[PDB]
Amino acid sequence: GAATGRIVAVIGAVVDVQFDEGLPPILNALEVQGRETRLVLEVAQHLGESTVRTIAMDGTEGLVRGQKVLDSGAPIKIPVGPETLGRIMNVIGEPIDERGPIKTKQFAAIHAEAPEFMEMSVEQEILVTGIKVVDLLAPYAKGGKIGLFGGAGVGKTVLIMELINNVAKAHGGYSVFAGVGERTREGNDLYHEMIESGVINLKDATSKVALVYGQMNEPPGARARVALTGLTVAEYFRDQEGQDVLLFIDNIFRFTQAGSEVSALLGRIPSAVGYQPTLATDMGTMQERITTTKKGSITSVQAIYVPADDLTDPAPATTFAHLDATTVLSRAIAELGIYPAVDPLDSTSRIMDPNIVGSEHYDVARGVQKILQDYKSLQDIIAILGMDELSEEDKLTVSRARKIQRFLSQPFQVAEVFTGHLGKLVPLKETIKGFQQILAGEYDHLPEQAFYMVGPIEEAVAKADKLAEEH
Amino acid sequence: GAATGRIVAVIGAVVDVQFDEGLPPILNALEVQGRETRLVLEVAQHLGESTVRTIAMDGTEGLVRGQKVLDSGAPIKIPVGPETLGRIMNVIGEPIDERGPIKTKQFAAIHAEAPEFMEMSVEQEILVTGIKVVDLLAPYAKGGKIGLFGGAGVGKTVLIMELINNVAKAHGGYSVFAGVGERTREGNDLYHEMIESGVINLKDATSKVALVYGQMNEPPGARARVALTGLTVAEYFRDQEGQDVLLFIDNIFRFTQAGSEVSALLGRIPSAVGYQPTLATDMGTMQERITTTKKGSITSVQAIYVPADDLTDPAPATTFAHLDATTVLSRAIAELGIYPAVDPLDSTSRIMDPNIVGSEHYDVARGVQKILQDYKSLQDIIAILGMDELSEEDKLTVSRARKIQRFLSQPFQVAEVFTGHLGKLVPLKETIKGFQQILAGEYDHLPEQAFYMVGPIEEAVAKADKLA
Amino acid sequence: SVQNMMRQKEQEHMIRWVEKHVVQSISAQQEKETIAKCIADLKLLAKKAQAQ
Amino acid sequence: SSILEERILGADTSVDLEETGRVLSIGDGIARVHGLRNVQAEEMVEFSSGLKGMSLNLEPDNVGVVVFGNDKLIKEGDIVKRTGAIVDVPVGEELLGRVVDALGNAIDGKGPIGSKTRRRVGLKAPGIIPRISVREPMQTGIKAVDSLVPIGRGQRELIIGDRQTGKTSIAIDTIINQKRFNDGTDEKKKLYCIYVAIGQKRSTVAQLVKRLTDADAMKYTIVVSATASDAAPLQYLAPYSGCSMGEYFRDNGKHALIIYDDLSKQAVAYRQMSLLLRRPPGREAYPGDVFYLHSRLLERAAKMNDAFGGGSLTALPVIETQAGDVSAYIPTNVISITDGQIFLETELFYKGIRPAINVGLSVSRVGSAAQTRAMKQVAGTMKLELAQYREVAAFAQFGSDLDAATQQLLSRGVRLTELLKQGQYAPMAIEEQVAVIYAGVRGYLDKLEPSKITKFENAFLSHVISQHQALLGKIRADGKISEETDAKLKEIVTNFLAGFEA
Amino acid sequence: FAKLVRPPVQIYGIEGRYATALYSAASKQNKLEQVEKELLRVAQILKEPKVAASIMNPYVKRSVKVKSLSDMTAKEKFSPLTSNLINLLAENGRLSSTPGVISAFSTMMSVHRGEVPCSVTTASPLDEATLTELKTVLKSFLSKGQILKLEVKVDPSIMGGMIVRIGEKYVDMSAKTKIQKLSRAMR
Numbered sequence A: 001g002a003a004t005g006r007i008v009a010v011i012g013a014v015v016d017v018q019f020d021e022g023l024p025p026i027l028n029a030l031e032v033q034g035r036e037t038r039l040v041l042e043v044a045q046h047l048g049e050s051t052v053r054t055i056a057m058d059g060t061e062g063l064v065r066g067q068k069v070l071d072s073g074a075p076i077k078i079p080v081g082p083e084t085l086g087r088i089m090n091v092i093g094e095p096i097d098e099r100g101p102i103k104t105k106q107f108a109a110i111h112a113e114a115p116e117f118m119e120m121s122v123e124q125e126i127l128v129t130g131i132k133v134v135d136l137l138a139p140y141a142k143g144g145k146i147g148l149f150g151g152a153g154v155g156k157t158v159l160i161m162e163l164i165n166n167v168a169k170a171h172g173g174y175s176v177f178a179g180v181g182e183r184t185r186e187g188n189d190l191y192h193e194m195i196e197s198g199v200i201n202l203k204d205a206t207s208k209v210a211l212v213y214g215q216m217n218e219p220p221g222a223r224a225r226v227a228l229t230g231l232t233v234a235e236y237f238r239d240q241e242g243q244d245v246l247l248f249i250d251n252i253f254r255f256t257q258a259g260s261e262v263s264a265l266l267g268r269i270p271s272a273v274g275y276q277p278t279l280a281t282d283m284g285t286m287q288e289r290i291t292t293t294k295k296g297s298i299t300s301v302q303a304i305y306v307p308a309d310d311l312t313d314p315a316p317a318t319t320f321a322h323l324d325a326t327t328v329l330s331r332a333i334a335e336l337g338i339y340p341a342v343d344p345l346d347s348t349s350r351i352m353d354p355n356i357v358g359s360e361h362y363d364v365a366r367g368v369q370k371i372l373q374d375y376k377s378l379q380d381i382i383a384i385l386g387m388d389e390l391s392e393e394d395k396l397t398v399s400r401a402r403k404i405q406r407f408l409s410q411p412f413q414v415a416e417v418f419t420g421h422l423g424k425l426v427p428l429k430e431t432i433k434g435f436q437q438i439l440a441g442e443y444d445h446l447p448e449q450a451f452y453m454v455g456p457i458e459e460a461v462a463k464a465d466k467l468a469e470e471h
Numbered sequence B: 001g002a003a004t005g006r007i008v009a010v011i012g013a014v015v016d017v018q019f020d021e022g023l024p025p026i027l028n029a030l031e032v033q034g035r036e037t038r039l040v041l042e043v044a045q046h047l048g049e050s051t052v053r054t055i056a057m058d059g060t061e062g063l064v065r066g067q068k069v070l071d072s073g074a075p076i077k078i079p080v081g082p083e084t085l086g087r088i089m090n091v092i093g094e095p096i097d098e099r100g101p102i103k104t105k106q107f108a109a110i111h112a113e114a115p116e117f118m119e120m121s122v123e124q125e126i127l128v129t130g131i132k133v134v135d136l137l138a139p140y141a142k143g144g145k146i147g148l149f150g151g152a153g154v155g156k157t158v159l160i161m162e163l164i165n166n167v168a169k170a171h172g173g174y175s176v177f178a179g180v181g182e183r184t185r186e187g188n189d190l191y192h193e194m195i196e197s198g199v200i201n202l203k204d205a206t207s208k209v210a211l212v213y214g215q216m217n218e219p220p221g222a223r224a225r226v227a228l229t230g231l232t233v234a235e236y237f238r239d240q241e242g243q244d245v246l247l248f249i250d251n252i253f254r255f256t257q258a259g260s261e262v263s264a265l266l267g268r269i270p271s272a273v274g275y276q277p278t279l280a281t282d283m284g285t286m287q288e289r290i291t292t293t294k295k296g297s298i299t300s301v302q303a304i305y306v307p308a309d310d311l312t313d314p315a316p317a318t319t320f321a322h323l324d325a326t327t328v329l330s331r332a333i334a335e336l337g338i339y340p341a342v343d344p345l346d347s348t349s350r351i352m353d354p355n356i357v358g359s360e361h362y363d364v365a366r367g368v369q370k371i372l373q374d375y376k377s378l379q380d381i382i383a384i385l386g387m388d389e390l391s392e393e394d395k396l397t398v399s400r401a402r403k404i405q406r407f408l409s410q411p412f413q414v415a416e417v418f419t420g421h422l423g424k425l426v427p428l429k430e431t432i433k434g435f436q437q438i439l440a441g442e443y444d445h446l447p448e449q450a451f452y453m454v455g456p457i458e459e460a461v462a463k464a465d466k467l468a
Numbered sequence C: 001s002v003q004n005m006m007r008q009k010e011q012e013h014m015i016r017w018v019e020k021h022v023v024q025s026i027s028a029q030q031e032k033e034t035i036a037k038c039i040a041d042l043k044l045l046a047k048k049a050q051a052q
Numbered sequence D: 001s002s003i004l005e006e007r008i009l010g011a012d013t014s015v016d017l018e019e020t021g022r023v024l025s026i027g028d029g030i031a032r033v034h035g036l037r038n039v040q041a042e043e044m045v046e047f048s049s050g051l052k053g054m055s056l057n058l059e060p061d062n063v064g065v066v067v068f069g070n071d072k073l074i075k076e077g078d079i080v081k082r083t084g085a086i087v088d089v090p091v092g093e094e095l096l097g098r099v100v101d102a103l104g105n106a107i108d109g110k111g112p113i114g115s116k117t118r119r120r121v122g123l124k125a126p127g128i129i130p131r132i133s134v135r136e137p138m139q140t141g142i143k144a145v146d147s148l149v150p151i152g153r154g155q156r157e158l159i160i161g162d163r164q165t166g167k168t169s170i171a172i173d174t175i176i177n178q179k180r181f182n183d184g185t186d187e188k189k190k191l192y193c194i195y196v197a198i199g200q201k202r203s204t205v206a207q208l209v210k211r212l213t214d215a216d217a218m219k220y221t222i223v224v225s226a227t228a229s230d231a232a233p234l235q236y237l238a239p240y241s242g243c244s245m246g247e248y249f250r251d252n253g254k255h256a257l258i259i260y261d262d263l264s265k266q267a268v269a270y271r272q273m274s275l276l277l278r279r280p281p282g283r284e285a286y287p288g289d290v291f292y293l294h295s296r297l298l299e300r301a302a303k304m305n306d307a308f309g310g311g312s313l314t315a316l317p318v319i320e321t322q323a324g325d326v327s328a329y330i331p332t333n334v335i336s337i338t339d340g341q342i343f344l345e346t347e348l349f350y351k352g353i354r355p356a357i358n359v360g361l362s363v364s365r366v367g368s369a370a371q372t373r374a375m376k377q378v379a380g381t382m383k384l385e386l387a388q389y390r391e392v393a394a395f396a397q398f399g400s401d402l403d404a405a406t407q408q409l410l411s412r413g414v415r416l417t418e419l420l421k422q423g424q425y426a427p428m429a430i431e432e433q434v435a436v437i438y439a440g441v442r443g444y445l446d447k448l449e450p451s452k453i454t455k456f457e458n459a460f461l462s463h464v465i466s467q468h469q470a471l472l473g474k475i476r477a478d479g480k481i482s483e484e485t486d487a488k489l490k491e492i493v494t495n496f497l498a499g500f501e502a
Numbered sequence E: 001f002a003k004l005v006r007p008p009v010q011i012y013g014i015e016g017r018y019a020t021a022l023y024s025a026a027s028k029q030n031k032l033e034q035v036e037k038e039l040l041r042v043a044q045i046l047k048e049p050k051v052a053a054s055i056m057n058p059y060v061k062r063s064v065k066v067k068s069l070s071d072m073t074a075k076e077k078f079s080p081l082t083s084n085l086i087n088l089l090a091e092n093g094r095l096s097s098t099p100g101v102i103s104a105f106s107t108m109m110s111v112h113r114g115e116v117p118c119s120v121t122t123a124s125p126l127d128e129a130t131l132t133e134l135k136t137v138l139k140s141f142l143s144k145g146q147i148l149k150l151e152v153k154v155d156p157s158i159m160g161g162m163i164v165r166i167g168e169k170y171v172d173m174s175a176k177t178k179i180q181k182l183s184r185a186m187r
């Protein structure tokens, strides 16, 4: 032990310590003595006369002034390796699932630097997940970065637990789920949704996922560092082993928002609407360690809460640059029963390109989006003129556009407890062919209720015969 | 002479004063020696090492540092008793009617606590007033708090001059009026209208009303404490005499507007749009003493101001949890001419209930809000498109809900001098009977200019008889 | 409801009579205070003994 | 009298050395205390006059302290003592049927509560291992709630809306309606309740104990009460104390329920209490951790696994919003902690839908769909028949006529809309709900008039409880509406419709 | 920078900045018990209607209050490290708080052998046979090689007891115990 300081001022969750002999640098870890639980404080400022300003990682009850504080000599050191699979872990790297300890032979301090310019893999690919809005309109990429926007209650824990089913079971590489401040109820489903589905095995060593869980019943200094315990386990699988990883994080807005809860208690003047003045700096320190270098790859899927459906808020609008692919869920669409809620005219990918996805995939998805923006100019006419005043060409537009809008919906497999339907998984070659024909006119003779919640286009004519027999 | 102090600092109406031994406890009174009038300082804080910070009741101009200050021993006390009736007082309880001193046997402090839980009375009744908007849609009780929310220039005091003219005449017990921060010529025309009408008796002991006054010329340590003065003369007439007292307060916003003018200088970080940090604890300590209890009954009527016509402002919108009835007035209603400009959709009660107000009345109540909402929910389409693009059923919730809006405006007794129209009082049973004959559809041939500014329903067919 | 209310009005008066009478009875004594001081020494003599 | 003398011989006059800090200031509730060396944070300190307080800030010179009471008996130069305990309230079943203040002292006057165990107000929510999913139902007796927006046991559901729309009445029909299970026989269908009154005047809380005692509802609840007259550190401490009496039940086997009325008044008691401690303001002068204030509260509402006891703790937070705007600061921070919501409006209340529930927007993570088996049959089809209605029934101006095409479907909604209305303080049962909902969806009401269905309901309901008591006992016992049970109900509605209006 | 000796009081404010820079500087070279004798002689020449006429005067000059005290602090008795300290306070602008520092250095130097005295608060005073016990049974508590001190203040509102405060201890035995009989009236 070195520099056994002493506590002087516990104001909120911001403890200040005073060292007799040895001042520790910024970003270290400190160990408060005499407590039956492990409370870890991380150094953040140097004040003068050998006092530092730390931040606790637990509850600050029972902190009497004049209490000793040890020092470890480094930032927080978590376990890492291959034996961290099928486990749930704390922010300071501890078990929280009551299975015993993590027996690894390698530790990684959670503060590292972004890899340089000359370690940047440049190649793009495609990735097929099975969904007719992802694979048609905002396609993924093997190694890219993927963000799931949208408000509260629009479908982000479902769309992120369906892609865990689709991709992260038919995958050779590994996956990590980091829970940065969400409901502890929802962190009990996914622990049990994947014990029966074989992704976690509680007796042998063939699990393929690792879990990091610090939830919204936690003090707001520990809800800023489970975003970094995630991509330290998800970097040993990319750098050290030459493997391929998948990164699942829900929710990453609670990393930013838990930095605004201790800004003024640290001693800063608050910026615009209430955020800390280091928004785009502490964020970009983290969102550059999630990259694919020339030693491995990372495919990252992060859920991004938009507060009060306000996309121009500074916490989401500074995240639109750290990402290759955006899938923006709206709420005015999921009120029409359409599920997945994904906005067709607001999602966007980089590889939507006539030289990677082909010049048939490209001509389709730029005619779906062009007929849906043609719809909205007619909806302002219908509100005054009524439907039976329009011409015969514009009536053909609204009918196909409502056929396309209903065909973008698809029953997921995880809606087998909510809706009672059966799940689909559409291949890419059928997705392009089905949408190509509704634009042509080869299904102009059907009712719209056939197209709601089907898979391939051949199931959308096997419904229009059952509706006509039961008539 | 418990203690002697010298003024140390003076900022507006927050005088600092240092003692040497014998610190006064908080909310004592201090007497400034060496002035022509009485200057009383009331201790607010304790700033460390024998130094208090006070708030002054009168003006502080002419004070020098070192000027002596003497300790009373007690809070502001006022003379209370049955001789207080017919007399006007100020914040420290001195006669400002120039008719000589007030000689009672006892004195009552300004600051006292709240009643307990087990001294509350739950019994509810109906106080019929004589106003159609209040009798039908939002009935007042006999022993409960009432608010009259309104902007500037809508009618919150012409409405309070009616609930004196209809309730304080037919009352049997006493009455107490308080003026907190409103203008002084209106506080003079309540003296020369209660002397003429027998409520003030200058010659013997047969007077009913007490008066207490602190107006909009005072320093803001007086407006912040004049409302706790009339609140004390209306508790002796409850707990120690056992009567049924009225209490009329106008205006109670200035208890709070003039409390965020001395809160900046006490050294406090401000909360939202500019108010004090303790906006809603000092209000819940003044309002928690205006209660009906097991020993008497106070029937409060408070006028409340909304700043710049905004109901989400923090000073009106925290008063709502302290009421029983509610009469939200409006500006755009009163641009049409509907007086009393009461919002029928925003006004509530706790006794509007089919078992209390009677199951026949309760169905004319909820059934006339239903036809009023459905006129509001089509104002988007009528304003753009027209009346002429509607159905035939919804040209019959439009023409029936314009006969109902006009049949809520009543000529008041106090407003005869303005417009020259006779003030009408309707009873309760002739409004329920008179709205069922607009809901069932018996008057659908009479125009809408006949339902306007009339009393009982037979004047509506008589006004329709005139125009032909 | 008459039996209970007359007990409540009697109860508060019975408390204040014992309370307001003990103020003068404790004030008048002058010999027992010297008895009261030596036990106050002996309590403090007993108090520091159990600490160390 | 023997009672006063026996209270004075049981009194213990114990004396010991305290640990003591001289006061340096007292203003507006905050007492900066010199001294107090070994004090903890969140410790309870005790002034000389009998007051009590909690030392929040620690600092090298002074020690910030907030008071549970009134700051006028406290003068500069006083004495602050040390208890030696982080702030704790009594707990147990012995508090049942009382009205208590925010520190567990009775304000009803039935005496001292005899309580044996004490539990902190700052304890921790349980994690990921000791929970389970939501298996059971919680019946409110409202018909728009139980059929369309069901609520499981262990699920945080938010009642949100304006002032004077029904937020308190919704959560008091729920208190009344569990009377039928609490005098029954099984110990796993009961539901013990708790009401927390924050920022309310005493002429509403002494009136709600009246409404809860004629119906004998008060024999199974507790009322923790912090009125608007209380100190601002007493309205802050109230939901953390009420939630800690809920976790006597949940951590021992039973099932609890807790209403916070409301939680927009536990925030302005934190904004004021922590501005006078000189803490810098955030948005709307709220502190930094108002999200941490509500989140560390609403995560104790668990549903434990069956190897711990299996108990549950529902929660029903009320939130008042200004002008019906849901995008404010404190609303959106608590929408995203709760599983589902109930959106109460004003134009529903005034047009006539009372309880004014927006059944379009009142979403709910259904709680593993523990509605019940028979209600799934009749309210499964009801949910879709009402959803079909709302897409197509908003014209108010008709020009064309399609009675075979559209006017049949919208005639099924107004018969099911006017069925959904209810009264006040008279909540139904679930098999009395299956019967009245059966008659609406099966076409047995399209030949009435909609101005007679509220009259049709009570004449129907009185006929089935009187003449058909052994019918409804096979729906409640067997769970489902069987095919022979479908047979018997087919006559009863038609026999009554043959002689309803005559 | 370097580490410094910890003063056993550790006060704060504008006093304890300068009153610890003096304690740390004089504890080097073991100049501790000497310097209090020199700080009590500037503690008399500060109160003079010519010296205090310009030690707190704003409008003399920024510079001439430095040469006038440096000539004054050296010639009469002493030239220790206090002559730099008076030159340090005067160079900064803290001449007004000069009596504060020596009252702060005195309470910091007193605890090096002192007690922070108790305060017996009982009544009209007592005899020798009951006081020399309390001046000896109050020594049985501390037990650290020390020579105790004390204050006395008479108060009659305490009707029948004595309160005492050894540091921050407060063992109270008085007529507060009438208010503790609220439990008779408290059901």
Ligand SMILES: Nc1ncnc2c1ncn2[C@@H]1O[C@H](COP(=O)(O)OP(=O)(O)OP(=O)(O)O)[C@@H](O)[C@H]1O
Residues within 6 Å of the ligand: B321, B349, B350, B351, B352, B353, D162, D163, D164, D165, D166, D167, D168, D169, D170, D354, D355, D422, D423, D424
């Ligand atoms: N089921 C119901 N049907 C019709 N009216 C009702 C019903 N429930 C309550 N009300 C009426 O609505 C009014 C408001 O109800 P309630 O007091 O519960 O609203 P609230 O929003 O809780 O009030 P506050 O804003 O003061 O908290 C009351 O007058 C009550 O009588």
Ligand SMILES: Nc1ncnc2c1ncn2[C@@H]1O[C@H](COP(=O)(O)OP(=O)(O)O)[C@@H](O)[C@H]1O
Residues within 6 Å of the ligand: A151, A152, A153, A154, A155, A156, A157, A158, A159, A334, A339, A340, A341, A412, A414, A415, A418, A419, D364, D365, D366
């Ligand atoms: N297939 C589906 N598509 C859209 N929504 C669904 C589907 N199945 C269920 N839902 C409902 O939509 C809600 C979405 O909430 P959820 O995605 O769990 O959390 P979040 O608030 O993070 O979006 C769920 O409560 C669920 O009831």
Ligand SMILES: Nc1ncnc2c1ncn2[C@@H]1O[C@H](COP(=O)(O)OP(=O)(O)O)[C@@H](O)[C@H]1O
Residues within 6 Å of the ligand: B150, B151, B152, B153, B154, B155, B156, B157, B158, B159, B339, B340, B412, B415, B418
């Ligand atoms: N019942 C009424 N009939 C006609 N005019 C009214 C009525 N009530 C108010 N007014 C008009 O509105 C004004 C309201 O001002 P007043 O009520 O005196 O104070 P405030 O500005 O507080 O409302 C009156 O001067 C009067 O001209």
Ligand SMILES: [Mg+2]
Residues within 6 Å of the ligand: A156, A157
């Ligand atoms: Mg989610």
Ligand SMILES: [Mg+2]
Residues within 6 Å of the ligand: B156, B157, B182
């Ligand atoms: Mg006025």
Ligand SMILES: [Mg+2]
Residues within 6 Å of the ligand: D167, D168, D261
């Ligand atoms: Mg309510």
